[model samples]
Target chain A: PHMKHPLQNRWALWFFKNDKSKTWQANLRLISKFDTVEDFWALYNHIQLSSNLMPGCDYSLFKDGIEPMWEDEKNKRGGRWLITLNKQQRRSDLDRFWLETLLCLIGESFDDYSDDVCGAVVNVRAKGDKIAIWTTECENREAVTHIGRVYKERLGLPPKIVIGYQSHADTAKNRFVV
Target chain B: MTRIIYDRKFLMECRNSPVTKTPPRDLPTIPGVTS
Candidate 1:
């Protein structure tokens, strides 16, 4: 028997459809939550990939207690390591980057700084979609730099393509770039 | 807690699982309706 493998934290997969109401809060919905590796695959296989997501739709994955928003408690002071894809890359590495982001989120890839991670978000847009990896604090230099470094490497992007960390607060510029 | 080493082997194990054995429980949420 394949014993179920449990994850360290329960993760929530949320979906946002661009409804005519123009109210984002109302449009955001939970597609599923998974705590085991097995269930993660099942949920993943059952849904639409970010590549196929509607232009205005979004796919977000966050830890159980964390809502997929910058305004939340753990996230209010935090920031994200963003990968802004070019049009060519949008069709090339977009889905791969999105998938690995989920893998790293669940895999807890940052070692000592794992607790700092809050979630990851993918926004499907008319202009190329963006992938953001969110963490709990920007002031912690060790944690922030480690996350930014590991993520850039794990996504298999070359050094020519650097990633930037932007704090959600004040809607500002990069706190760190790798 | 020892995080799962997400190697190709681990990834493959999950990918090879019976598709029906652990299906997702959340049904599709209709637009404007909170599940």
Candidate 2:
């Protein structure tokens, strides 16, 4: 076998295509799993950029064994740091931002708090595109904010553009923001 | 197909709403919905 550089954790890439006739669960498909740096690139290169996806489609890269859904046991208490892009950004920044997000994940840019990160997703839509990093344990204010700050910087977004971190439960109630 | 950028104002409204809560008319736009 060829040499491979191992990553600290394995990741699964999921593809979601919206189908009016199908249940949301049915439309989400696990595309591939990779743990090596080389393999990660292989999978990433083989797939379409988030911008290339049709509206209503999504790409999720989650740590192995953690489902991308909020309902997943590992994700139940977590929240996401969201970045909503304007329509014009779809061509100008969507793919670049998405790639940077993925790099942050696989690179474990969060340092000691990297374990707090669960995964990330890119949602493509006609109105606007959205990107988010899912983190475990939203109540851990220190970890959450740390991850958020590092993530925003890694994406190279302007400091004036503030992003919010919302927990799954709070998201339902529309209350919590960090 | 026209692409309309979601502005900061819309994001503010979205922030007030739950992350998982699908936008009222576009229930299909939820993060998890797939074909």
Candidate 3:
């Protein structure tokens, strides 16, 4: 008999394409999802690499029922582990790193802090590309830092690639990277 | 090797015992929204 394994929780994939003339909510599109391991890999392999996405576009994988916007009830009080990559690394490291980030999400590498992690996003921009791991609660210092350390380690990121955890409120307030 | 015979039919029965089925939960409507 064949059987399929289930994830701790279901997740959804979302894609954001910037349309200057349209509302931001209109630009955010729901992609697809799966609760099984094989389905996850299938979708990942079929999609375009983050580096290949047009500038100002983004790819986000989040828990089911949670929208990829700050207004979502699950995300209003949350925050993200922000990783800003320079233009030079786009061709060099973007693809593989984003792949590992997805693995960490489905693999549940953060122990109990796994629940804290809402999802992740990879943004391609004119200035540079950015990848962030969004968490459900910014006030949870233990869970946030644990997720950060393990995430950095999983990607084999060197000390120089220092990542920062920024609250959604702060990012929204400043409209700037930390 | 010793040849031993077992009941394959019984094993298959166990595999088909019960099926699981459930519907998705219906979430509530937001405030200020009318049906």
Candidate 4:
């Protein structure tokens, strides 16, 4: 019996390579989508770890139908729970943090509020690489915090390192921190 | 009872499979994408 563990949602893995000659849309590619645990592992194990990706590159994993960008219909009104990593931290913790982030989504770690999650993105930039879990909306009081709390807890982060929730609407104000 | 896992070599093949929904490398333009 070849039993496969199926996920609640199919996820799309995207790769972005920064090139001045190409348009923004042209630089982004849909790497693949996977709905099973085995397939997810298969895909992940085959790809370069986020830490190894060159600066000016990115990897985003969002739900199958939702494109990995703020302008997407599901993303425009939402916000992201952000984590900023320092230069050395990228070499030290980026891969583990990213893998944990993926597990949280695929495993549906957020009890009742899992449905509120849209996806996640990791941008490898020169200043500093960043990781964030995107949600469907930012207005909810309980759900958004629950996500941050659970997500922070999963990362086993020290209490001193605060995670900030910023609106995709670029509301430029509210931040539900954890 | 033995817990069985799929062969490692076979699992690798799943990444390149046609049914895996591997998307195009790029699109001329995408909806909802405004930089």
Candidate 5:
């Protein structure tokens, strides 16, 4: 018999490939979801890695019943911790970092702050790629900071690497990078 | 204990309540949502 672990919550995986002809909501698609440890690995193995996805595409993993967009009720009051990676890091750091992000979510590494975790998203782009952890409430200072500290440590990010948490309201309101 | 606690709190809170005749907000026709 093999030992396997189950996560504290169910998670949904979503994929988005921006299409100019389609509305933003239409272009965003829900891939699937998994609740158990084994199922998560199976889905992860089957999907394309961050480096393999085309530019302007994204993969977002959110809690079941929660959509990955700013429009979703669970996410509307939330924010994300952005980890921007330049083009050069994509070949080496992108896949590993994404894997770690998923692991952190599944493993519940953020302690009490785990409740605030909505999900994570990775944006593939020509200029640079970004991976972000979306948290449920931007106003929860303690949870947000604690999640960030652990997230930074989990990703093995250097001390100098600064990450900014940006609210969905900010993103939706500006529609431009802050 | 865990199951009972969950049932007493979160689970039952989310369970559908029949007392209200008003339309639900989560459904497609909620007040603030665009039709």
Candidate 6:
């Protein structure tokens, strides 16, 4: 038998092309699914870097059966801890940050609150790039904070750098500062 | 091992737009979202 390291949860990799001509649903597509450490790397190695993706594209990794949209049943009540990057950081930080984010997901790096995590996404844009880690319930303040704190540190972001979490139900006007 | 479903056409059509970039202060509800 071949040895394999199984992840705590299976995840789906989704690709989004921000085609202006198509509906939001039409632009989003499910790329693949993976459950083991080996497969995760295999898929990641085969894909283009987030930096290499044309502006207006995104790469999302989410739990199986969970779509990468705000409307997904598992995501409707959730929110994401967002990290924004400057355009200059694209060549310097984008790839490492994204790879770290993915490792945090599959490695269950959030300790006891690992289950709170739903997935993560990276957006490539002309103005700037962004990375968001989605959690299952924003209402669970304690859990959300713990996950956010751990994730920020895992990315090795400076303590002075503050990130925030926003619920899907709330418009951009509201966010939980962590 | 997990089953891998490869969709070539879907991958080829992966397109993006640049007009709808929202800052973190006014982040979109969806992640990796397109406008």
Top-lDDT structure, candidate number: 1
Give the better candidate number (1 or 2) by TM-score.
Answer: 1
Candidate 4, residues A92-164, lDDT tens digits: the string is: 9999899888888877778768888999999888899899999988887688999999899989999998889
> Per-residue error at A45 for model 5, in Å?
1.1
| Cα lDDT computed for each candidate against the true fold | 0.81, 0.75, 0.72, 0.79, 0.73, 0.77
lDDT of 6 by residue, A144-174 (tens): 9999888888788888998999897883333
Query: Is candidate 4 or 6 superior in TM-score?
Result: 4
lDDT of 1 at A73: 98
Any idea what lDDT model 4 has? 0.79
DockQ of candidate 2? 0.02
Q: Give me the displacement of residue A164 in model 5, in angstroms.
A: 1.2
How many residue pairs clash in each candidate at the backbone level? 0, 7, 0, 0, 0, 3
TM-score of chain B of each: 0.32, 0.37, 0.28, 0.32, 0.21, 0.25
By summed lDDT, which 10 consecutive residues of candidate 6 chain A come out lowest? A169-178
TM-score, cand. 2: 0.79
Off by over 4 Å in 4: A171-174, B1-35
A134-171: candidate 5 lDDT, tens digit per residue: 98888888888888888898788888877788888887
DockQ of each: 0.35, 0.02, 0.02, 0.06, 0.02, 0.03
lDDT score at residue A106, model 4, on the 0-100 scale: 79
What is the C-alpha lDDT profile of model 1 across B1-35, one tens digit per residue? 56555553576577777963554655574442222
Worst 10 residues of 4 chain A by lDDT: A168-177
Tens digit of per-residue lDDT, candidate 3, span A41-129: 44554556777787888889998988888778878898998878898899988987887787778767788788888899999999999
Steric clash pairs (candidate 2): A17-B34, A17-B35, A18-B34, A18-B35, A19-B35, A87-B5, A171-B18
lDDT of 1 by residue, A58-86 (tens): 88899998988888999999999998876
At residue B9, candidate 5 shows an lDDT of 31
TM values, all candidates: 0.89, 0.79, 0.78, 0.81, 0.78, 0.80
Off by over 4 Å in 1: B1-5, B19-22, B29-35
Candidate 3 regions with alpha-carbon error over 4 angstroms: A173-178, B1-35
Model 1: which residue pairs collide? none
Model 5 — TM-score against the truth? 0.78
